[PDB]
Amino acid sequence: STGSATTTPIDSLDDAYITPVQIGTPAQTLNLDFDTGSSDLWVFSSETTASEVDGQTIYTPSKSTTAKLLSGATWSISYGDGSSSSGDVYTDTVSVGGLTVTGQAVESAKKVSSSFTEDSTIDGLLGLAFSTLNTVSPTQQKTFFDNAKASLDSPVFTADLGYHAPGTYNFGFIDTTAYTGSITYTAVSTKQGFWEWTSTGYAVGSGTFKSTSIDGIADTGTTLLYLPATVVSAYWAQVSGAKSSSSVGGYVFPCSATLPSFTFGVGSARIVIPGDYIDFGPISTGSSSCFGGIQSSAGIGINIFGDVALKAAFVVFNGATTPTLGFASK
């Protein structure tokens, strides 16, 4: 089997991407944030505290003839950005772009934190990291990809995120028309439950490539690119007027600037992030100070290849017995 679904930016900045997901019988379609940095499929639901719902589409398990309460099961998750949610668990039929899993754990939110409430466009998350990070207790549950794997033509999914445009998540096959040149594969460590890999270095603009190992995670659920302070300082030094602002919470730059590109290494290959991808616009409405898309990972504890990086590539998440990551230009 295979699946193919379009993923759409939630706003003009590409702050996140939503992908339609069918849950239950008859289908209830919810727009979920596919997140390769976490491993819970959770949804706004009929059980969500009413004051914490503001425009989201909800899953109502009582209206699904295939929903079954997973007795005794609860979940609770906290994300790197400080947001959180928690609730109980159903199993139900879940389909993504024509690919169907029966008995998928659907985590029903009873509580969500303010940032979720305030984002009317995201109805929940669909985790695509390794199932070892799944928070369901007392019986840990599998991700959608893990459940689908054996049935897929090939045990892979691909992320093809657009810049200010729709893109695609494919399951079970590699669309050879979706990228240029070849796919370069690189080793993955699953020890922290993430799609963790090591980049071979970076360049700023038309500058020389610096060979240096940068360990990080491929995370579709993080907006920006978070790298070591040394790397990030080197990038923003090439932008007149750029500075790190503690009051704003990172590097800002004059909105009048032309940003240089940023290149990262995947083995001997190179992925180029155009300068425009690194612009996240005014820090507040009307401001001429703009927020940078490359930020320091210092104090996160991990480097994150988020959407800013991933949307410059066609990315293969290879879930073979020994997982690997593949990157191609596009």
Curated annotation (Swiss-Prot):
EC number: 3.4.23.22
Active site: 35, 199
Taxonomic superkingdom: Eukaryota
Coiled-coil zones: none
Molecular-function GO terms, alphabetical: aspartic-type endopeptidase activity
Domain Peptidase A1: 17-328
Protein's UniProt name: Endothiapepsin
Source species taxonomy: Eukaryota, Fungi, Dikarya, Ascomycota, Pezizomycotina
Catalytic activities: Hydrolysis of proteins with specificity similar to that of pepsin A, prefers hydrophobic residues at P1 and P1', but does not cleave 14-Ala-|-Leu-15 in the B chain of insulin or Z-Glu-Tyr. Clots milk
Keyword Cell inner membrane: no
Cysteines joined through disulfide linkages: 255-290
Family: Belongs to the peptidase A1 family.
Encoding gene, per UniProt annotation: EAPA
Example GO biological process: proteolysis
Residues of the full protein shown: 90 to 419 of 419
Keywords: Aspartyl protease, Disulfide bond, Hydrolase, Protease, Signal, Zymogen
